[PDB]
Amino acid sequence: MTLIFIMISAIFVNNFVLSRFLGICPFLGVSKQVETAVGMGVAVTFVMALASAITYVVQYAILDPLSLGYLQTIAFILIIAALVQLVEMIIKKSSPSLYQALGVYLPLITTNCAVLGVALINIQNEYNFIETIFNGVGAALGFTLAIVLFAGIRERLETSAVPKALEGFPIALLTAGLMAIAFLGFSGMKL
Amino acid sequence: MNELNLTVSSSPHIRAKHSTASIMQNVIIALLPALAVAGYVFGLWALALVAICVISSVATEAVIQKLLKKPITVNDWSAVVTGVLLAFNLPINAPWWIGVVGSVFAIAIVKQCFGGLGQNFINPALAARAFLLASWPGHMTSTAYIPLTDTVTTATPLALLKAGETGSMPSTLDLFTGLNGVYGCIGEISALALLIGGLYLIYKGIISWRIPTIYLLTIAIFALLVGQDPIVHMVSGGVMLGAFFMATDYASSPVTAKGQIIYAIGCGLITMIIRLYGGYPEGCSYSILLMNVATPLIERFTKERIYGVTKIKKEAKA
Amino acid sequence: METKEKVQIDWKVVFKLGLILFVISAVAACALALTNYVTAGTIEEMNVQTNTVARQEVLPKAADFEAVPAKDVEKIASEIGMEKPEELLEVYIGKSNGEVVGYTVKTGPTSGYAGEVQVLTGISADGVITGITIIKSNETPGLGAKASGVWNDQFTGKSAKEELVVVKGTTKEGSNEIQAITGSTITSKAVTSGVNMSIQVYQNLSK
Amino acid sequence: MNVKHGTFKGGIHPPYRKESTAEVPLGFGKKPEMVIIPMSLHIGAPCTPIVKKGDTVFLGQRVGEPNGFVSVPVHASVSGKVIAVEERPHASGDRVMSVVIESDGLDTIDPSIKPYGTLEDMDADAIKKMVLNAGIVGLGGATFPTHVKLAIPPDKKVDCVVLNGAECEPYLTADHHLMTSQAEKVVMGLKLAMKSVGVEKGFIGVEDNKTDAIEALVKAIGNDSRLEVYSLHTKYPQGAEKQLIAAITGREVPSGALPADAGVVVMNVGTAAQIAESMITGLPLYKRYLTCTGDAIKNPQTIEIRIGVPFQSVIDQCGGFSSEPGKVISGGPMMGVTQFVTDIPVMKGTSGILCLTKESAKIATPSNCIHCGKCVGVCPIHLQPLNIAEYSQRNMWDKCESNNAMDCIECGSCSYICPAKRTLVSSIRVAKREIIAQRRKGN
Amino acid sequence: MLNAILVPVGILGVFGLIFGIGLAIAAKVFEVYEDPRVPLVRAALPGANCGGCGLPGCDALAANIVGGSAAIDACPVGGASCAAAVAEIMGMEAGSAVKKVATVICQGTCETAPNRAEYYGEMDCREAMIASGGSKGCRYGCLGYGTCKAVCPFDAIVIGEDGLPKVDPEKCTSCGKCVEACPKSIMTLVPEAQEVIVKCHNFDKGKIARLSCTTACIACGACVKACRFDAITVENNCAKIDYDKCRQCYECVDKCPMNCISGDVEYGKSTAYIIEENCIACGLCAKNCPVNAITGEIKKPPYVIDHDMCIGCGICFDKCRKSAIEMRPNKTK
Amino acid sequence: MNFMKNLTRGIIRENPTFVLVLGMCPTLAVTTSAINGMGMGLATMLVLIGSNVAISALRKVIPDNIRIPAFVVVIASFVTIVGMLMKAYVPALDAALGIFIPLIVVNCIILARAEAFAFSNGIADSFADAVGMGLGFTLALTILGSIREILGAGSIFGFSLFGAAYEPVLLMILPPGAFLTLGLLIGLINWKTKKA
Ligand SMILES: Cc1cc2nc3c(=O)[nH]c(=O)nc-3n(C[C@H](O)[C@H](O)[C@H](O)COP(=O)(O)O)c2cc1C
Ligand SMILES: Cc1cc2nc3c(=O)[nH]c(=O)nc-3n(C[C@H](O)[C@H](O)[C@H](O)CO)c2cc1C
Ligand code: SF4
Ligand code: SF4
Ligand code: SF4
Ligand code: SF4
Ligand code: SF4
Ligand code: SF4
Ligand code: SF4
Ligand code: SF4
Numbered sequence A: 001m002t003l004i005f006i007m008i009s010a011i012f013v014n015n016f017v018l019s020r021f022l023g024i025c026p027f028l029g030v031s032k033q034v035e036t037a038v039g040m041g042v043a044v045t046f047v048m049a050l051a052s053a054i055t056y057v058v059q060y061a062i063l064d065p066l067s068l069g070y071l072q073t074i075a076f077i078l079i080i081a082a083l084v085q086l087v088e089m090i091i092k093k094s095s096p097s098l099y100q101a102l103g104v105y106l107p108l109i110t111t112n113c114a115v116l117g118v119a120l121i122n123i124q125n126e127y128n129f130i131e132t133i134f135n136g137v138g139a140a141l142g143f144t145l146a147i148v149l150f151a152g153i154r155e156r157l158e159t160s161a162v163p164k165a166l167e168g169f170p171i172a173l174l175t176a177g178l179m180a181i182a183f184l185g186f187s188g189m190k191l
Numbered sequence B: 001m002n003e004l005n006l007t008v009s010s011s012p013h014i015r016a017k018h019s020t021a022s023i024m025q026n027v028i029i030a031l032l033p034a035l036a037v038a039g040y041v042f043g044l045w046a047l048a049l050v051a052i053c054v055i056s057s058v059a060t061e062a063v064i065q066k067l068l069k070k071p072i073t074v075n076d077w078s079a080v081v082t083g084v085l086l087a088f089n090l091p092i093n094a095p096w097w098i099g100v101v102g103s104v105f106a107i108a109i110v111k112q113c114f115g116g117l118g119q120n121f122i123n124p125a126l127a128a129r130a131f132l133l134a135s136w137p138g139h140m141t142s143t144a145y146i147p148l149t150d151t152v153t154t155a156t157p158l159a160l161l162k163a164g165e166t167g168s169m170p171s172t173l174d175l176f177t178g179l180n181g182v183y184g185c186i187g188e189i190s191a192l193a194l195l196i197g198g199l200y201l202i203y204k205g206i207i208s209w210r211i212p213t214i215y216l217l218t219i220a221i222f223a224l225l226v227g228q229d230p231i232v233h234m235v236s237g238g239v240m241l242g243a244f245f246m247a248t249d250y251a252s253s254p255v256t257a258k259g260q261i262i263y264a265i266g267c268g269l270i271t272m273i274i275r276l277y278g279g280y281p282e283g284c285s286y287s288i289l290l291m292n293v294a295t296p297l298i299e300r301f302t303k304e305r306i307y308g309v310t311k312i313k314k315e316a317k318a
Numbered sequence C: 001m002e003t004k005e006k007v008q009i010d011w012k013v014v015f016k017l018g019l020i021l022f023v024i025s026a027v028a029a030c031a032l033a034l035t036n037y038v039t040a041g042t043i044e045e046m047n048v049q050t051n052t053v054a055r056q057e058v059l060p061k062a063a064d065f066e067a068v069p070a071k072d073v074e075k076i077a078s079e080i081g082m083e084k085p086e087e088l089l090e091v092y093i094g095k096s097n098g099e100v101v102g103y104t105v106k107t108g109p110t111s112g113y114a115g116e117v118q119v120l121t122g123i124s125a126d127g128v129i130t131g132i133t134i135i136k137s138n139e140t141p142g143l144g145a146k147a148s149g150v151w152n153d154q155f156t157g158k159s160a161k162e163e164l165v166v167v168k169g170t171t172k173e174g175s176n177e178i179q180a181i182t183g184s185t186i187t188s189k190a191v192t193s194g195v196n197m198s199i200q201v202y203q204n205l206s207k
Numbered sequence D: 001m002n003v004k005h006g007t008f009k010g011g012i013h014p015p016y017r018k019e020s021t022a023e024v025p026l027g028f029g030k031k032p033e034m035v036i037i038p039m040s041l042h043i044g045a046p047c048t049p050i051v052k053k054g055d056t057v058f059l060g061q062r063v064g065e066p067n068g069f070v071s072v073p074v075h076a077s078v079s080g081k082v083i084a085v086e087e088r089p090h091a092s093g094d095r096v097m098s099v100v101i102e103s104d105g106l107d108t109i110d111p112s113i114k115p116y117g118t119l120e121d122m123d124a125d126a127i128k129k130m131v132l133n134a135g136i137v138g139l140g141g142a143t144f145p146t147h148v149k150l151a152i153p154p155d156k157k158v159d160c161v162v163l164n165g166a167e168c169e170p171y172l173t174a175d176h177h178l179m180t181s182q183a184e185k186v187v188m189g190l191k192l193a194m195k196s197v198g199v200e201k202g203f204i205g206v207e208d209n210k211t212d213a214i215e216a217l218v219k220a221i222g223n224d225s226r227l228e229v230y231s232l233h234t235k236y237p238q239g240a241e242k243q244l245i246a247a248i249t250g251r252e253v254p255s256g257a258l259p260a261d262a263g264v265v266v267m268n269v270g271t272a273a274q275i276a277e278s279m280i281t282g283l284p285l286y287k288r289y290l291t292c293t294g295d296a297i298k299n300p301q302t303i304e305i306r307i308g309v310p311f312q313s314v315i316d317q318c319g320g321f322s323s324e325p326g327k328v329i330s331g332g333p334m335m336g337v338t339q340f341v342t343d344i345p346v347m348k349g350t351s352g353i354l355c356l357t358k359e360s361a362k363i364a365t366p367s368n369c370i371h372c373g374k375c376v377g378v379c380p381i382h383l384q385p386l387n388i389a390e391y392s393q394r395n396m397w398d399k400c401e402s403n404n405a406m407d408c409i410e411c412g413s414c415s416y417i418c419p420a421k422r423t424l425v426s427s428i429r430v431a432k433r434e435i436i437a438q439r440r441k442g443n
Numbered sequence E: 001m002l003n004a005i006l007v008p009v010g011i012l013g014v015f016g017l018i019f020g021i022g023l024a025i026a027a028k029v030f031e032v033y034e035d036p037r038v039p040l041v042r043a044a045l046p047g048a049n050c051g052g053c054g055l056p057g058c059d060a061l062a063a064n065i066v067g068g069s070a071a072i073d074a075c076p077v078g079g080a081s082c083a084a085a086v087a088e089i090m091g092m093e094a095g096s097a098v099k100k101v102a103t104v105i106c107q108g109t110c111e112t113a114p115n116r117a118e119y120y121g122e123m124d125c126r127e128a129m130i131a132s133g134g135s136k137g138c139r140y141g142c143l144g145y146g147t148c149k150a151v152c153p154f155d156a157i158v159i160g161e162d163g164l165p166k167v168d169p170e171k172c173t174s175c176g177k178c179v180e181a182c183p184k185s186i187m188t189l190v191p192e193a194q195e196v197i198v199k200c201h202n203f204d205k206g207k208i209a210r211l212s213c214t215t216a217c218i219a220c221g222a223c224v225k226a227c228r229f230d231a232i233t234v235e236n237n238c239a240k241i242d243y244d245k246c247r248q249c250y251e252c253v254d255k256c257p258m259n260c261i262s263g264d265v266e267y268g269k270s271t272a273y274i275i276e277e278n279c280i281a282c283g284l285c286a287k288n289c290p291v292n293a294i295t296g297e298i299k300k301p302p303y304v305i306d307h308d309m310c311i312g313c314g315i316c317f318d319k320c321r322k323s324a325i326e327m328r329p330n331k332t333k
Numbered sequence F: 001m002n003f004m005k006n007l008t009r010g011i012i013r014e015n016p017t018f019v020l021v022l023g024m025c026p027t028l029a030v031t032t033s034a035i036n037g038m039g040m041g042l043a044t045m046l047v048l049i050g051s052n053v054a055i056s057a058l059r060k061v062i063p064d065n066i067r068i069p070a071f072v073v074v075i076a077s078f079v080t081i082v083g084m085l086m087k088a089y090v091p092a093l094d095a096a097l098g099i100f101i102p103l104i105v106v107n108c109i110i111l112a113r114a115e116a117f118a119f120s121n122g123i124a125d126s127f128a129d130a131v132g133m134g135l136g137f138t139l140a141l142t143i144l145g146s147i148r149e150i151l152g153a154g155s156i157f158g159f160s161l162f163g164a165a166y167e168p169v170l171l172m173i174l175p176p177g178a179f180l181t182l183g184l185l186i187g188l189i190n191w192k193t194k195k196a
């Protein structure tokens, strides 16, 4: 019952993109189509699902019983970097090469602010193995849902008369603000 | 040496009779009896606020349509509808500038920044109401709805229902007619007038029965499955107005028939989830606003079948 | 058989890639540990000083303070029927020329809007409230961060004999009544619960 | 008789102003004094003139020779003298090579015309030869050659012939008069077509507002058990060769595959009457029916008029203009073509002349889309016209093609029901033309 | 002090070494993509996604090389020098090209070619072509709704107050986006050095064209006799000029009775403007080149020649062994 | 000649906030006042200068396959040193920006400029580029923070303007109140870019 509540809070009540201001740059970058959004979502889900357990083991097996808690951040980012490299090492080989249209947002997966953010959040909340895994999966699913909804709204807006001066980024920011209001309605629930 | 000077164009050469202005005027005619009941119950200040909102809306639109070098299409009676529906969402103890700010936000940002009429994807009036509630919670929460002459009530029916004190709530007939001690928003206290207005619009052909029927059916089923009263949960709060006039917006609803059923079911589920376990006494506005975001996703999976197409089993995209 | 017998030097270029990284990592550590040392000491000192400042304002007097060995704190928490433990952090005793002046108690109540608030309360000998303060909060800067302002100053003068309740109205009625901030209610209730548990601890101890 | 019923999904309900000319008797035009006959009265390859200036021609003499296989000859309507073999204005807006013949007053029949035979000995090959020699094209509006339609390729199988009697456009009443007056000729033409194709099944589809025509056809059929009559609900796109197939047989024509792949052969009642008349008498196609009506016509009526008579003579024979017209249309109000002048001659596919006044020809300027969704509900092909129009208006042909814009039948109604008074069908036509053009310059 | 420095150094070094070795091993496996000759042509391209292409972008052109699936000179917008720089990475090429600009062959402006009727609908050329081809008196003229302006990506076309477009030669870059977008097939490409253009597209006979427009072509054929280099031909009842054989003699301009040929009477008149430095008293140009224009006696330098006639073709500028004659345009205005 | 152009690319021509849209999380998260934006901009400028100089000093031995680990190691070392100093000496700014001070290592601008300009240039161009980017980031953050604070609190730099009876717009200091504001600003700039 605790795992379900943790997942629900991570997905709906405390969405990482629309509430906590973490995954914003790829949110505005690769949300022009539905397929690219789905691919980015599944890649990011794999990255956090692999990273959470490794960060938990590294923090609780080495850093804590050594009085070396000031290296945490740099150690953490090192691991994430290697993982992202391996992801960038696979997508060009086996995954379709036409998906290399992200345009600098592929090496910025380390910079996505949601992997390291969820790692620090899991460390600060004193969770366990299963709780950390569920929190990471819930955060990834929330990111995927938000980016898919944004891509659908943009595809709908493709046939609207945005006059001449707003066009891409201003109307993307206004749409994100309206979605943020709608999710501000989804708050105050105690779980 | 007489010429003819005829006209050349493309087919067809005949059209129907209905237009946009007729539709909006019919909507206003449907909304009139609720305004009459509000003026009877809350007094002369309940009408003036409405006027203020309407004026502001029209003025804003004209100014924008003058500054962007566009034809002034203010005679389609759309800003009047937006202003009236926004004014129906206000308490009786609100200052004069709240309506002006809400109308400016509803017209300038939500509507005219996306192209104009029919080019937006979200409800203007509900978004302006949500912005006003978040910005100024003191003027819109639980005390502004009670008139200053009454000093015995001190609570609206939904707040008493959430608190568990179902011994002092008004009777079901009083909640259905809105005539004995029922307080709230000025255009939501009576369910008979809104039902008559919705039936008139169904008869004319502007709206359909699907969303209004399925919204209320889902609410009743949810209320019956948890051990509550289905009739009370349907005649209190802003549910009839939302079901008949605000969830049937043209620019925010799906165009098919199955998408409308899914949209209504989702709205009815989220409304009761926020009502029963949320941090608000009512969740109609956010349930409708959350289904304006998922609408483009429903519309890509509920398309009909073309004539003469027997479909290929997912082999064209391979 | 390692993908068709890679030709010898394919291993040698491995030794080039790791070593440099190793060196870089060492250099990073060779900085950070030194930057760890002196700052840490200063940080600790500053924190301690700040903490004692937070005490010296809560009980305006010229006296000394003594701290319990924290086993009595756990004994007090175990008794009286405290539902949620570990919510009492520090209890201090004031001493001025031997006579007991009062107590200073720090507690973190749960059930806030955004987590845990830290509330410090001081009390004189006879049951009164000489003032409260907020040490740590994570609330909204424009909505829940107003507790550390003029709202605190109204807490003084209340007797430490009965409980305190919150009323959602401008009228303050009479005794043991707290008027909440408009648009911010859960934060007021958390501080009220913390003050109530402090009063219960004082009533148990001073008898 | 066993009369069945049929209907389809979608459509509109126009005012159906046919009551004006329905009760008026049938009129006959006077003898013309000058005829202009174009060289392209069909689709395919235009003919070549075989007459010179100053020549003398007979009634029914050929004045044009077909070029290829998809082509029909062109004959003369009156007997007189040829005065010009130049090019003259056409109904398409541009000048077309024609032959001008001045009448003499006497109708001298060419001394080479004799009846072809009877139904019991003609057989299929001679029936097809007679159809080709008489220059019969489709009178339903498309003017497709009939001898090409009756030549079924060996890789296709058909088993039924359907006659189209569901006249659906407003103001038009010629088919009602033809069915009520010449039902026996319609039945004979249906039997001839059935023998030519080689099937044993035949259906006739008539709408339910022509019950007298249904009774006349039932009486004319007699005791034949291979012929049936259907009643269809009165709707506008009912008679468009596809909804007729869906209503009568229940089958669906595939995506871009012609009705011949559904096993049916669709033909008009006027074509059947012309086939029967040409078999009985031996004369070619030189005369048809018309409906002169509108808002600026003094005395609207249905009149039989030869081929080559200008529009102005027809207008003058029906009273004239009560007021200044604002629009002259060749055909119906939902699929007609607006004209520039009144020197246009009538053709084999002309079914009516509609003149509108200045007040009835005014349509408001288009406005913004309000997302009402009625155009989705009225489409018989189950498309979404708003998306295709919005994609076509900003030059996105790939999105138009991916949204199935190539199977629209250009039927009107989607543009008829719009509250914002837009031009959806024109945008769909532009998209279709661009998609068709891009397949030739890139392949 | 020793351990506090020793432990983190060892831990971080071990982590870095293990991660580096693993990353090298993974790179030796998954990087078998084996695409050689890194693009190196995108820098020599300058591309702006104009439209004289159809490979999915200039980066797609950079990726498409080393496979031999694309032409060397597939990009005409950049020019021959741009293609030379693009495929100069491997080299073995050299070339040059000629610059061109878009032009409109029509001069009927809303008063010489009026309208037959009134048109209702959208203001676009193709939409007007749906409504029976338009409402203009001339069936081959300009509609005037500016589709070509709408499809131009570089902003070079402006619709004038007379109804005909105007093209800025400084902003037009030799593409054809406005050429296939015109429903009337009116927009064409002409070299920037050409000033003699027949501006009409009427395919009718004499009387009908004369009634249709003020400056129509009636196919009289008087412009063919004036030309002697066989550069202008009349077919399909319309005249056209071949730009590869036109010497710009300005003889057909003044012979047209309906004023369909562009250009002004300011040309030539420089018969034997011979530099005295590099002719040897040649005596060869005096005899004949179709006009007399030279006649004299020996003509020792400086030359004494009166200039009052001849057409100024330009043949006497390159046929000389030393090219002592200089061509200079000097006339009234 | 080649230094002033790199220094002055910076704020106007290639502004990271208005023209590139990078580093959006601290832009939309901490800009509820005119003081947080300035401190965040100064800290990011110091980290950017140090990281750019360090990376450009070593563009001769780093291979292509392990560039990201070395880059993040250097950036994280500089971030840790700066954060330790700020914790020691400026505790109020640390408490105001607690979560985003460890997150300067991943800021979408430092890594982007490291792999695009610092890797293939000298020690003098990278320094000027870092200074220009830091100045542009600081100016944009200060402008956005002042605009948000004036509307949502009724005071600029802590000095009240409208009196003590003013009722603020509390949505401007909320997460949905940033997006719209930023969008409008960008639109205005684009208009003045395109109509001039
Ligand atoms: C919208 C639409 C309506 C039509 N209505 C009729 C009609 O009422 N009567 C008719 O005979 N053909 C009508 N047609 C033409 C038929 O589709 C078909 O071409 C015709 O039956 C062929 O007749 P034919 O074999 O004599 O050429 C219509 C076509 C369209 C697209
Ligand atoms: C049936 C119907 C319902 C409408 N509902 C709303 C509504 O809930 N809120 C609003 O602001 N405007 C409403 N409008 C009017 C409004 O101008 C329009 O529908 C678009 O939402 C404007 O983009 C409604 C109009 C119609 C015809
Ligand atoms: S889209 Fe085509 S088939 Fe559908 S209603 Fe319009 S014209 Fe008819
Ligand atoms: S009928 Fe007209 S206004 Fe309604 S959805 Fe279709 S195109 Fe839009
Ligand atoms: S025409 Fe040449 S430069 Fe332009 S987009 Fe195509 S390939 Fe690139
Ligand atoms: S040149 Fe062609 S495309 Fe341009 S306005 Fe004239 S007709 Fe239209
Ligand atoms: S005017 Fe025509 S050729 Fe010139 S740039 Fe524009 S589209 Fe290209
Ligand atoms: S006649 Fe020639 S110049 Fe005159 S409008 Fe027609 S094409 Fe243009
Ligand atoms: S300018 Fe001279 S060369 Fe050119 S077409 Fe005219 S006469 Fe011939
Ligand atoms: S002289 Fe002029 S009018 Fe005559 S053919 Fe030549 S261009 Fe045409």
Ligand code: SF4
Residues within 6 Å of the ligand: E274, E279, E280, E281, E282, E283, E284, E285, E286, E316, E320, E321, E322, E323, E324, E325
């Ligand atoms: S043509 Fe040349 S070589 Fe001959 S006389 Fe003239 S300048 Fe001399």
Ligand code: SF4
Residues within 6 Å of the ligand: E271, E272, E288, E289, E290, E291, E293, E310, E311, E312, E313, E314, E315, E316, E317
């Ligand atoms: S311009 Fe021609 S004709 Fe005149 S002198 Fe030179 S070569 Fe002879």
Ligand code: FES
Residues within 6 Å of the ligand: A022, A023, A024, A025, A026, A111, A112, A113, F022, F023, F024, F025, F026, F106, F107, F108
């Ligand atoms: S995702 Fe760009 S800085 Fe956080």
Ligand code: NA
Residues within 6 Å of the ligand: A017, A018, A019, A020, A021, A180, F175, F176
């Ligand atoms: Na947010």
Ligand code: NA
Residues within 6 Å of the ligand: A018, A019, A180, A181, A183, A184, F175, F176
């Ligand atoms: Na939110």
Ligand code: NA
Residues within 6 Å of the ligand: A073, F079, F080, F083, F084, F101, F102
């Ligand atoms: Na840090």
